[PDB]
Amino acid sequence: RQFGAMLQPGVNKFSLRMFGSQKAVEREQERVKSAGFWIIHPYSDFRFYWDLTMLLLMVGNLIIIPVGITFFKDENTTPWIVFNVVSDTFFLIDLVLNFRTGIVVEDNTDIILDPRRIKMKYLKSWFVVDFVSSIPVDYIFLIVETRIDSEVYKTARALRIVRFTKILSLLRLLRLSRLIRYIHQWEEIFHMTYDLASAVVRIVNLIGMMLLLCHWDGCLQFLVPMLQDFPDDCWVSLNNMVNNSWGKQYSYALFKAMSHMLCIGYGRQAPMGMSDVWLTMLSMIVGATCYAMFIGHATALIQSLDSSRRQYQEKYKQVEQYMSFHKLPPDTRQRIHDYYEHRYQGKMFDEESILGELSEPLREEIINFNCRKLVASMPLFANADPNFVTSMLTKLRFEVFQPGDYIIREGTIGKKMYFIQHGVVSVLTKGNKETKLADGSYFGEICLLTRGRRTASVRADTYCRLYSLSVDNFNEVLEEYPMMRRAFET
Amino acid sequence: RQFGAMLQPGVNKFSLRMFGSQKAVEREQERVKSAGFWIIHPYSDFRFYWDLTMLLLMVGNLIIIPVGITFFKDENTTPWIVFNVVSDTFFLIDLVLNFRTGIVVEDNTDIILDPRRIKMKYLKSWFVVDFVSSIPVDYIFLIVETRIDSEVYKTARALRIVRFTKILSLLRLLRLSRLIRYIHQWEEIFHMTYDLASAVVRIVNLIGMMLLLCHWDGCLQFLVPMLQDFPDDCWVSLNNMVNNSWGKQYSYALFKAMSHMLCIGYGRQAPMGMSDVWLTMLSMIVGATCYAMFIGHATALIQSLDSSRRQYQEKYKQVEQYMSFHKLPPDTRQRIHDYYEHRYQGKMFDEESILGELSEPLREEIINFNCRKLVASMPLFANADPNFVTSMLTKLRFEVFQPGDYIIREGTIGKKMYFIQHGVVSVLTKGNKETKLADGSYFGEICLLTRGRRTASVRADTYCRLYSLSVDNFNEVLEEYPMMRRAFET
Amino acid sequence: RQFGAMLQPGVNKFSLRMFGSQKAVEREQERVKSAGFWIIHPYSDFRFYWDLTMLLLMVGNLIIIPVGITFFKDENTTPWIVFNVVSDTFFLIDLVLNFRTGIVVEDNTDIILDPRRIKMKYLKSWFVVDFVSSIPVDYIFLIVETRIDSEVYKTARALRIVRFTKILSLLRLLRLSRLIRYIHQWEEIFHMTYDLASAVVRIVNLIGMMLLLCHWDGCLQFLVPMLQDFPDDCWVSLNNMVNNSWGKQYSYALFKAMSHMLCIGYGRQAPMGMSDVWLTMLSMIVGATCYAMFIGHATALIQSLDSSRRQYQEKYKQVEQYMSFHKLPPDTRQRIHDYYEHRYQGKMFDEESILGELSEPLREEIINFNCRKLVASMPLFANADPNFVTSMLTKLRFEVFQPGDYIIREGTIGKKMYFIQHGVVSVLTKGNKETKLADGSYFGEICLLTRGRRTASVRADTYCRLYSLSVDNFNEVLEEYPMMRRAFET
Amino acid sequence: RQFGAMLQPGVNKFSLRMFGSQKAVEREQERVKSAGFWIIHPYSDFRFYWDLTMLLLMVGNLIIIPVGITFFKDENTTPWIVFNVVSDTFFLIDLVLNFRTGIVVEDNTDIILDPRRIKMKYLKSWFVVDFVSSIPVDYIFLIVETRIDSEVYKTARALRIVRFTKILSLLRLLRLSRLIRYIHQWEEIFHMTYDLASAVVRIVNLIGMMLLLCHWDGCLQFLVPMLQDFPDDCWVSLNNMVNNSWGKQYSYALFKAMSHMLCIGYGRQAPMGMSDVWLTMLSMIVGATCYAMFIGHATALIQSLDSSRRQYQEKYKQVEQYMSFHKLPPDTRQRIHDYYEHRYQGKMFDEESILGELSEPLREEIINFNCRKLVASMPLFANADPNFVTSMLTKLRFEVFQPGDYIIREGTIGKKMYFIQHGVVSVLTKGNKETKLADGSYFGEICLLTRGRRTASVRADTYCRLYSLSVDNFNEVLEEYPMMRRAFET
């Protein structure tokens, strides 16, 4: 009874992350607990360990089945039959426990209590191939022949029947369907892989798929000549590899299939019999098409890694052509380039969209973390309450000046007041000699309470990073807060 | 007379879909019925079955003509002449009924009653090649020779004349023009294919076109050596395939042409005579260029299948670089990632454009289906009339909070009221212990009629999916409806 | 004197198009006539015919020079020296008249009267290579040897000197610089080619460039073995092509170079001497890199032909994922698909940008051509003056309803009035039986003068294409026109 | 002591550019001068010359190590040991001075005074491979064998031990890690290379990397047969290259590796022993995959050079489909094309974004340089002060009319006044005969002070480039300046 608890998802970094909170974990735990009979939750640690063992089984079979069919004349030995029957039992349990399982759609739990509803969905999608690739069809074929024909050994049928055994045993490698199914599942369901698109994981997927195609192709290149008992014009009988060892035969047939794949050649020579020509042609067209598609795939998947730099390069070419179209002096043309490279750093983003997409809690977390220590330094705001403070902070603006600008103009209208955030400025006066501010200071206070002319003029001494604060936004926030609208006059 | 009714489009899932309503079907039915003489409507079931038979004919001819020209020495037998003449009659009827047909431009009916207007358009576009590829030009050439030269058998001309027969019979495979024409027509005119761009259909189109080019190339590789009567340096005479059977000759010449196409080799060896070198060169350059273009095509057509996921990946890289550029704590950096993955689910869309593109009926169908049961639950709105209801519902906003947010802040200005749509929240009070709402409830009613301070503060206990409802939009809709503007005070 | 008039641009479809008006043609005619000495205007018919003859010369030389150097032992005959000297005279006149010519930058006339200013620019860019590839350097080398060495025939130097003649005569094929220069000039300066990017022209450019590289590569593959006098391990001496004819030698060396280019093989065999290995390696790497770059080029240039359809496919995938994310009934999911396919027709555009980019004259030409006959049909507007009419028409909106919509709702607020433009609607009333309007009618008049409730309700009977006309835009235009603001009340 | 000054960055075009101002240069100079012990600033001329010498060393070793291992039987001579020990000393100093160095992150100085903090970061990243590739591991292996085994010469171990010496000496070519590290550093840190993405530099990087892979592959193809002492089926022993010279052996093994890379063939023949087959297979798959990835890379990097022209082509195809969708007369369809080609010149930009991205100083520099001489020409503005002038100039608009437009309409409302900037217009009157203005004039003055009807109507006689100036923007700027609001009435 207590072992029936692993069949429901638990507290685990993967479940916790994909759910968000332990409360959500127990939530589904109960959503499954709506069940009467044991239903496997797809995220239940049981099914994860199941699928791990079954991934090992599927890979072992897809690698070992063809090599055992084609090479190893008289393949039935005391082992390899234990192997096929153990694999068949595991995959039959896979077939059964496949009906009684939790499906997931849209990341929304689809656990379907109705066995028929899950059974119907499985029947539609994959139960047919899983059935055809679960039962040892070759063994039941051999059986319905051994009983019917006593003279099978004496008759030519047994040779036909051994050829049919070797051909029908090839069904077992439709389990590639389950392999790709469970891999896609436990890679997109997997979160640490769902991130970045995991170009490493995806390209290793692709390398594995090409290597498997090439290895099955090699075993095929050797199966088809063998079935016809090595005619005098099959490569196995011109390369004189009839009496060789299964290592050399496999290695060289894999050589041929990989030649055809990369379009580098045929092998030691060019096909000479009709079976060779048609196999070479099928393998050339399939291998070369698949390889070129895989490489177009990986090329696009790599050139999608520098997207946010290609986009900055494009936006700067547009700035270049605007500058040209107005024929700007090559002094301003250099100031502009400096400013761009020192604002977008070879990577584009948008502090307006990327804040119109976030929710209000996240908007406020970023805004607060940015402007807290800055706006808290002023006395006229730090004394107010968080309502007014963090309803004002949403009017701040980002600004990246350049060494030499007149962030303020002497004796001029100062409609906005600035809050510095980085770099260092130097306020200037005709009378006063020098003064500086940096890394969290604030200037321009003479403008907020009353409008007039600025008593100074500051200069960016390095790449300052001020935070703007206008007055129209100010008094719009202000008229919402009469409480502090009254007290500012004094 | 009654059979002249199939020449006009009818009620049919394809016609119904491409027209929209049975009224539109009878509409055109009459637009064609503007005719006096039988005019084929391009969508008339007659022309569809016509084009089906003619597609079968064109494919049969493009596959059977070259193989019959090149191989089969003394090709004229009791069959194959019946074949050419039946094909010629069908294609001549195609030529005639091609003038008297309905053309379609922009999906706007172009049925042109004026025979001259349709005849002139056909003359301009394709009547010339269809004429050159309809009449058995080789037969009339042979005839204007048999009568003129009695000593044709005795003279060397007959050998010249049999070579010219075999060359001029090659015109019949300009019907590829009609094949691609009718396929493009009955694939874009076809709607279930016009959807998704039908990558399956398009890639099968491309595979068919490459296979046809490669098969014509094989027949050419064998035609050109044969015409010169197998010189001692043509592959047919070094591979010792003069006395072979037409199956082996075809299979191996197709082998060579496919080698040249994929750039895997020449064949058994490298060309040795000048005709071989120049054929191999023409075939190499044409095959390799065409194959590489087809594969660039299919690569782009496959990488256009994950567009709406590549675009989410790009937008998230921009969020990454915004986060970096402000150096956010790796707690907020994780909250943001969670929110994104749980709002755009690896697929981008825009509920603002995708509603500014739809018409007003569809805007209202989506808005209604979304917010009906939600806004109907409140008593203060369900009692009003659809005018006010569905003129208000256009101010609702979508919002996806995160487990732990303070969707409401305790004792704070509640300028907007929320309508929940999913998940589950938990209102909280200092005095009250607990309370919940979920899956279609509504809270925040104390704010609409009168403005003040919220008596509570709620928390997202899971990934809530509330629907916002402000008050400025509210009273803007309200001042449009004085009827309910008066009654809300009580 | 009168022949000095062709040196200035004239009235011609190319000049007329690239200038806009015959007044602009005479404008520049005078801008050049600012000259004292004959200056060639780059668009002067003289320079166009010049460049045509010179394009013929450059192509003839790039094809004939290598074939004459490598093959044709003892190449100096009574012809071919006339050929080199005529080509040298034409190209020297090209060098001279290259200084005295009109340059063009930004499509802004750059005709520079100052000979020094044009001379300085030419010196910087291309005068150096044009000088090195104009004078017969091999002839002056031969001359400074014939005079210095009487025993040249007797000495081994003459063999060295004939090798140096054959190598130094290779300079003449730097005229490829001029070829690509003049082609880019007379293709982008050319307008009918500057359109569409002329994918045909550009891909033929690329095919020509690959064919030229491959042909020079063939001549090189034959030059380098020959210079060493056919060592016993050069392909020319294993393929036994020493005593062959220049046709076979050229054809097969071009074969080899094209093999290396496409990466299909080497030739009859694989290199065996060190010169062969290093030539084959240089040619493999250069040919294969260049070919793959050309094909990436042409692939992108073809996949840039269906841009405005790929973009519709992307926008519709985003509509698909919006529909999914709200789980819409598969009835609305089909209405939406119908509307999209019947509004954007598989091709995206933006009637807002494409009207914010045009000038005001073009804005008014399109707006007028669209809405003239429609707005003129109403009596209350046709009686007003073009000022009010065409200041109102800028408030019209485009709208594509769908068979079955209630374009008007019965007894409802009709804030906008519609002008039909296509399709056919059917107004409905409880009392009135039926009525129709189509293809240029207008309805909804009861709303403009006075606001109330609509006395009817219309339905889209086919895919109507109405033109909206609101009342807020109406009275905003109205308050600008008091003249007609007064008279509407009656 | 004074030599300890080069260890800090100085005044230099690279430092000056990457910092912005000499004040910033001395700023960091002091930020480093926060140090007590000599710390290498990564931009210190010392480290730049260091890295130059070390780049020379790394390239020399990556080219000379493999060629010395594989060929040159009995490689230990009086030279080459001096070479390995000098290289080892330089690279060990690299290892030591690697701990005591300035790191840079985000272009923000990361100079870390704490030796442990820099040491810890280096330990994490690359100290491990740099240690494994710094010490002569093969020499210490040989030493711990020479002392232990006196009978090493007599025993079979010495042959094992010479094979292990030749294998373990291969560690030294992990310095490719440092090579790519220092190249990426001194190419992105390098600014003149960081511009344009420097497609030239990047493609030369890629060509160098492919050439190095191919050269190591050649040396490997020769190392692996040699270690097994040239079995009777290694290409070195079928191509009969055992007794050859190291030049021929190297050149032909590089031939083979480059064959496998481009997928052109194997070599003189196809592998025959198991070591040959497996090397050829490893080299085929690695070389072909890497080459195809490099070429996808370079293709995308070249097709990213015409981005701002591809984007204009796309925007114009959208204009084409808008024109079609409204079926415009092919006169307007030509006017529109002329206007586009003469406004966006085959290159797109956005004078609104590209001015919303710039700071306020740069906004004002471009605006001033554009409109200074234009707005200064008018008397009513030039007499005002820069405050009003340059607060007005931000309302100017750009506009490109077309020869024949009525920039003004006769006797019409002239809500905007124009400032010409290029081309030439011709004002017209019923009474007045003719008049012109061009290249910096100004017209439309009768409208600003008082509103009425224009007394004239002008025409674009060429492609004018006026600068618009509305009146609503005018009086909005005006009500901000009462000073000049009063004086305009007179």
Curated annotation (Swiss-Prot), chains A, B, C, D:
Residues 234-262 dip into the membrane without crossing it. Coiled coil: none annotated. Changing residue 191 to A: Reduces response to cAMP. It comes from Oryctolagus cuniculus (Rabbit). Hyperpolarization-activated ion channel that are permeable to Na(+) and K(+) ions with very slow activation and inactivation. Exhibits higher selectivity for K(+) over Na(+) ions. Contributes to the native pacemaker currents in heart (If) that regulate the rhythm of heart beat. Contributes to the native pacemaker currents in neurons (Ih). May mediate responses to sour stimuli. It comes from the Eukaryota. Homotetramer. The channel is composed of a homo- or heterotetrameric complex of pore-forming subunits. Interacts with PEX5L with a 4:4 HCN4:PEX5L stoichiometry; reduces the effects of cAMP on the voltage-dependence and rate of activation. Interacts with IRAG1; regulates HCN4 channel activity. Interacts with IRAG2; regulates HCN4 channel activity. The lineage of its organism: Eukaryota, Metazoa, Chordata, Craniata, Vertebrata. S-palmitoylated. This is Potassium/sodium hyperpolarization-activated cyclic nucleotide-gated channel 4. Residues 101-113, 195-197 are cytoplasmic. The chain crosses the membrane at residues 44-72, 77-100, 114-136, 159-194, 198-228, 273-305. 3',5'-cyclic AMP binds at residues 444-445, 447, 454-455, 458.
